[PDB]
Amino acid sequence: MQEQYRPEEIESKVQLHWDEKRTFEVTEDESKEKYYCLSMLPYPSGRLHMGHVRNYTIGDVIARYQRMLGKNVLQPIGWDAFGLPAEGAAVKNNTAPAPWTYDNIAYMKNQLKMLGFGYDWSRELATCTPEYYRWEQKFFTELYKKGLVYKKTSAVNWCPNDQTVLANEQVIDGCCWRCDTKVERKEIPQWFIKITAYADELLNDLDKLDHWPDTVKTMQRNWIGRSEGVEITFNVNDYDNTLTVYTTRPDAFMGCTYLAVAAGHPLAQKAAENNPELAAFIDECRNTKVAEAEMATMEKKGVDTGFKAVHPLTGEEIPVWAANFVLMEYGTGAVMAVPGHDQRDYEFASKYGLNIKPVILAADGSEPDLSQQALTEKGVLFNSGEFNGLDHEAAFNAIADKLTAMGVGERKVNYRLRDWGVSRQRYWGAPIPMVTLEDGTVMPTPDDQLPVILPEDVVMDGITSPIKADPEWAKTTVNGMPALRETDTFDTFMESSWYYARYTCPQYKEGMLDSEAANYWLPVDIYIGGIEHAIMHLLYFRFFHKLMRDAGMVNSDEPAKQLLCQGMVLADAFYYVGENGERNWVSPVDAIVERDEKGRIVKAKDAAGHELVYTGMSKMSKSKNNGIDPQVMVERYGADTVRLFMMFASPADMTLEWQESGVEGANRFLKRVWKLVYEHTAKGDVAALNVDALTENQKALRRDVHKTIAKVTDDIGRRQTFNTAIAAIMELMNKLAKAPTDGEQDRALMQEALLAVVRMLNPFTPHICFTLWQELKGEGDIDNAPWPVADEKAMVEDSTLVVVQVNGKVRAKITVPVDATEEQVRERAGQEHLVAKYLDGVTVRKVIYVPGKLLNLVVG
RNA sequence: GCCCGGAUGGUGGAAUCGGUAGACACAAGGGAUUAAAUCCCUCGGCGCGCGCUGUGCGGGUUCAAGUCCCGCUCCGGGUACCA
Ligand SMILES: CC(C)C[C@H](N)C(=O)NS(=O)(=O)OC[C@H]1O[C@@H](n2cnc3c(N)ncnc32)[C@H](O)[C@@H]1O
Ligand SMILES: [Mg+2]
Ligand SMILES: [Zn+2]
């Protein structure tokens, strides 16, 4: 051991040891108890950023902690390798998506290995390889055969000039991010999976996930959006078809003063013939963006269609209006409006002079004031014919029954949850295994033809997909005749919905899963990934587990026991507009910045001379170009310092604004730990510790040692508050550095304490701890060393601290024996001069005593 | 807009079940060795071995509120084709 901590001469050395010994390679060992510690797998974007480092350090801490408790820990890594970013990058750099992606994988693989994360590299997966995607292809055809896949027309962002489809991200400030011309809605036929078929199972099973946080569970309930309501059908005067709507408020049905229909609705299209105002409005509606965000923030607009629907209970003619917020793809493409008791309908009817009829009494039984807003709260009906005086419940059922008996209403459960559209019109994805035959029929690709391989040796024009552009590729032969296979590819979430299961048997060729290996490792003990995925990915992931259960492939009903959603690591983001309207994101490293009195960024320019637009703190990613690569710091201070600093910055679940300030604190701390072990071990082998024999100074220190063990164990195992676990270990090191080390008993206690500090610090900083454990002459490699256990006898307290307050304000703090009574504490508190100061001339009215903790004398 | 979070010294954060506000660190200033590195001292505000005040803003509950309740501002995540 050298005097100086030299990370550069340790980490690479210890990393190689792990590779050669295959330390973190695991099999399905029936002797050991299993623990599956999964971190969400990275997209190979180029380099890691600190977001990645936070995810994979949290993973590694739990992986190493649980290994040290004696478990067989699976910690796998792989690459979610299909995606959009590879297409625009490959074009711009004059490559194809496949080689760009595999380069990134190698680069990042190397970064991950330099951070020292104990992965089972034997189980490494790439989702873009046909050894992987063939199985989801096979699976999709089984899903079709089971009736869980259908095709329908769906809205996509379409560039009419280029004839390309654009993702929501690629549409910016209305126009496209390439050049200046409008982006329009185009309904295009596409493949969906009936996730709504499992909506109730997905909804109900959230009540079983008591180790998933409520942030995630509540977000998921609200996303699925289960409601029990009524579908209602209206005849329309001079139109042969009917209009069907869905309401959850059939109690306010008598205050329905108009209906609102989509721009795509045939009734709107029929009326557009003779109504040029409406025809212009429908044509305008193609500019509406395919994104909920923009559709709720846009100004609510509409035109009268001229068609009058018959209200089935009053018989009154009510106008049908075409509106820009009602859409054909979702639901019936028509809704009913009750402006008196729906605020969105109130705003619409106010703007266009439509009738605002009241039908719900206020809580006191008064007719409501609808002069500033709608009465959204439920109540008794008035102005409702035979339904007057009925409360909410009875009104719901009465109107439902009457509408059912008339044969124009039916009760119905609805979900906000729409089905999962898996079609993408992009090159870099697994091809969808469906086929169109010469005779017009559509069916799954036959099993003998799976996988449908995506060619990698291609030339990209950026506009069209190589497999769509070349008409030879689609040609196959099925049932004896010519067929054309699908040129659309799968949504990239398809590969990330079952990777966790494939990790248990990645080289298995006979099927999707080896169910012996899958049932040994599943379900996942802890799943670690960003709060960004709370809804979309986690929901698909849970849905896909239920599909594989229904194929008899897995045992569990849910895929993951515990879920730890870390906060986002944020950074400042800047851009400038280019010479044809293209956003160009600049890194915060390359941006000269001038700040406010409050610390806010007020001016920003790049090194060249472009006035930058500052968008704010947002998540680190390659898209906004605001990601900080760890590679520079790792080579400066070492991986252990970078890791410790990340874990010490903030509790895992809280979102972090990244800053370089603080790294030295971790670097210095590790130098202090190194020093203390250097000095202790230079003095040689130590005597055995004599417990019953220690002085009161020695007894007190050993209490703090064993209390750190208990607290750190709880802080990692239960709370996952690693920052407080490190702070506890740091405080013990300051105690240990001030302790005497002369006597045989002092050196024996220092041994016990350092053996324990090094093990507690190992999950965080495993390289330095691997080395230090050998210097302290610990048994074996620290990776398999047992986790230290606190000793109840060493932790027993002889006194406790009581806080003394007068009318809630702290006036003194006293040490008192643990077994002390209220009367003794009062008498001891009275002896304090600052307590007596505020008891003079006043009476003690009330006393509050929290045992061993607090006394409040309520005085006046 | 809608759903979910968050805000504590110059800075990141601690306070685990409503009971000590600022643990543990960073930055800064001062001193000690001799520039680096190391080690001490000081460090929420306003006026002292004291007093008041102080956890984004406005109210309220309580013996006691960073914490609970009612109303807000700002900032982040998702909002179904970024992953
Ligand atoms: C399962 C599949 C859908 C995952 C998908 N392939 C994927 O997300 N890939 S990834 O490279 O972008 O990220 C990998 C992990 O790291 C987290 N993360 C990413 N950015 C940040 C950030 N700025 N801050 C904090 N965490 C971040 C992220 O949530 C994920 O758990
Ligand atoms: Mg602050
Ligand atoms: Zn365009």
Backbone angle region of A639, left / alpha / beta, with phi > 0 → left and psi within -120 to 50 → alpha? alpha
Query: Which ligand neighbours the alpha carbon of A157 most closely?
Result: 3
Gap between the Cα atoms of A849 and A576, Å rounded: 63
CA of A570, closest atom in ligand 1 = 23
Count the Cβ atoms, other than its own, within 10 Å of residue A745: 19
A157-193 in b/e form (b: 16+ CB < 10 A) is bbbeeeebbbeeebbeeeebbbeeeebebbeeebbbb
Of residues A706, A710, A726, the one with CA closest to residue A718: A710
CA distance A414 to A203: 13
A84 CA: nearest nucleotide by C1': B82
Q: Which nucleotides of B are covered by protein (CB under 7 A)?
A: 1-6, 10-16, 19-21, 23-27, 37-39, 50-53, 63-65, 75-83
With helix as H, strand as E and coil as C, how does A663-696 read? HHHHHHHHHHHHHHHHHHHHCCCCCCCCCCCCCH
Residue A91 contacts residue A462 (beta carbons within 8 Å): yes
- Taking the centre of ligand 2 as the mean of its atom positions, its distance from the CA of residue A597, in whole angstroms, is 13
Nucleotide nearest to A850 (CA to C1'): B19
Cβ-based burial of A723 (10 A; exposed 0-12, middle 13-18, buried ≥19): middle
Instruction: Return the SS3 of A545.
Output: helix
DSSP A389-452: T--HHHHHHHHHHHHHHHTSEEEEEEES---EE-EE--SSSPBP-EEEETTS-EEEPPGGG-S-
Give the Å distance between the CA of A230 and the centre of ligand 1.
41
Query: Whose structure tokens read 């895929």?
Result: A559
Decide: helix, strand or coil at residue A164: strand
| A229 φ, ψ (degrees, to nearest 5) | -145, -145
Neighbour tally for A425: CB within 10 Å:
18
How distant is C1' of B48 from CA of A309, in Å?
Answer: 82
Determine the protein residue whose CA lies at the shortest distance from the C1' of B83: A43
Instruction: State both tokens at A459.
Output: 């030339």
Residue pair A308/A320 in contact (Cβ under 8 Å)? The answer is yes
Helix (DSSP H) and strand (DSSP E) numbers for chain A? 25, 33
Fill in the amino acid letter for A779: E
Structure determination technique employed: X-ray
Q: Which residue has the tokens 């003063």?
A: A257
Whole-angstrom Cα Rg for chain A: 34
Residue A636, amino acid: R
Kindly state the tokens that stand for A573: 């983001």
Q: Which of A133, A138, A128 is nearest to A456 (CA)?
A: A128
- The nucleotide lying nearest A858 (C-alpha to C1') is B63
Q: Atom 28, ligand 1: which residue's CA is nearest?
A: A530
DSSP A360: B
Contact A342, A312 (CB under 8 A): no
| Distance separating alpha carbons of residues A362 and A637, to the nearest angstrom | 67
* A396 Cα–ligand 1 center, Å: 46
Angle at A813 between CA A812 and CA A819, to 5 degrees: 130
Which one, of A372, A493, A517, lies nearest residue A423 by Cα?
A: A493
Phi-psi region of A435 (alpha: psi -120 to 50; beta: other; left: phi over 0): beta
Q: Which atom of ligand 1 is nearest to the CA of A532?
A: 29
Task: Tell me, in Å, the resolution of the deposited structure.
Answer: 2.6
Report the C-alpha gap between A611 and A337 in whole angstroms.
48
Closest CA to ligand 1's atom 26: A51
Assign 3-class secondary structure to A143-162: HHHCCCEEEEEEEEEEECCC
- Residue A564 CA, ligand 1 centroid: distance in Å: 13
Across all strands, nucleotide nearest A127 (CA–C1'): B83
Give me ligand 3 centre to Cα A162, in Å.
Answer: 7
Compute the C-alpha angle A460/A464/A470, nearest 5°: 80
Using C1' positions and the CA of A811, the closest nucleotide is B20
Pocket of ligand 1, candidates A49, A80, A500: which has the most ligand atoms within 8 Å of its Cβ, to mutate? Answer: A80
Distance between CA atoms of residues A197 and A788, nearest Å: 49
Other CB atoms within 10 Å distance of the CB of residue A511: 11
Q: Is A259 in a helix, a strand, or coil? A: strand
**Which residues make Cβ contacts (< 8 Å) with residue A274, sequence separation at least 6?**
A306
The whole-angstrom separation of Cα A81 and Cα A98 is 9
Strands (E), A601-750: 601-606, 613-619, 656-657
Beta-bridge mates of residue A243:
A234
AA identity, residue A452: V
Residues 6+ apart with CB under 8 A from A350: A339, A356
Those residues whose C-beta lies under 8 Å from the C-beta of residue A288, and which sit 6 or more positions away, are A185, A263, A294, A295, A298, A324
Q: Are A572 and A588 in contact (CB under 8 A)?
A: yes
Q: Contact, A157 vs A168, CB < 8 A?
A: yes
**Cα of A237 from ligand 3 centre, angstroms:** 42
Atom of ligand 1 lying closest to residue A656 CA:
24
Question: What is the Å distance from ligand 3's center to A169 Cα?
Answer: 13
Instruction: Return the closest-CA partner of residue A224 out of A201, A193, A248.
Output: A201
Q: How do A569-577 and A583-586 pair as beta strands?
A: antiparallel
Beta strands across the sheet bearing A524-530: A72-74, A34-39, A524-530, A560-566
SS3 A486: coil
Helix residue spans in A303-419 (DSSP H): 343-352, 392-406
What does the alpha-carbon distance between residue A214 and residue A563 come to, in Å, rounded to a whole number?
A: 11
* Cβ partners under 8 Å of residue A277, min gap 6: A303
In this structure, which residue's CA is closest to atom 10 in ligand 1?
Answer: A42
- Ligand 1 atom at shortest distance from the alpha carbon of A492: 3
- Residue A13 CA, nucleotide B77 C1', distance (Å): 40
Handedness of CA A138, A139, A145, A148 (dihedral sign): negative
**Contact in structure between A662 and A644 (CB atoms under 8 Å):** no
- A746 vs A686: CA distance, rounded Å: 10
Cα separation, A520 vs A504, in Å, equals 9
Q: Considering only CA atoms, which residue is closest to atom 13 of ligand 1?
A: A42
Place of tokens 């496209």: A176
- List, in order, residues 6 or more apart from A315 with CB less than 8 Å away: none
Non-local CB neighbours of A621 within 8 Å, separated by 6+ positions? A45, A49, A51, A627
Which residue's structure tokens are 């010994």?
A: A21
Distance of A157 CA from B15 C1′ (whole Å): 51
Degrees to nearest 5, angle at CA A77 with A71 and A80:
145
A788-792: list long-range contacts, CB under 8 Å, 24+ apart: A788/A709, A788/A755, A788/A756, A788/A759, A788/A760, A789/A709, A790/A706, A790/A707, A790/A709, A790/A710, A790/A713, A791/A706
| DSSP helix/strand/coil, A239 | coil
Query: What kind and span of H or E run contains A822?
Result: helix A822-830
Nearest CA to ligand 1 atom 21: A51
Which segments of A are annotated as binding site for ATP?
622
Q: How long is chain A? A: 860
Which atom of ligand 1 lies closest to the CA of A529? 31
What is residue A724's three-state secondary structure?
A: helix
Q: Which residues line ligand 1 (CB under 6 A)?
A: A 40-43, 51-52, 54-55, 80, 496, 529-530, 532-533, 537, 566, 568-569, 619-621
Do A39 and A528 form a contact (C-beta atoms < 8 A)?
A: yes
| Alpha-carbon distances of A635 from A8, A165, A632, A712, A766, rounded to whole Å | 8, 43, 5, 29, 16
Q: How far is the CA of A288 from the C1' of B79 (A)?
A: 16
Sign, Cα dihedral of A397, A400, A406, A411: negative
Distance B53 C1' – A678 CA (angstroms):
48
Render A48-73 in DSSP notation, one character per residue.
Answer: --HHHHHHHHHHHHHHHHHHHTT-EE
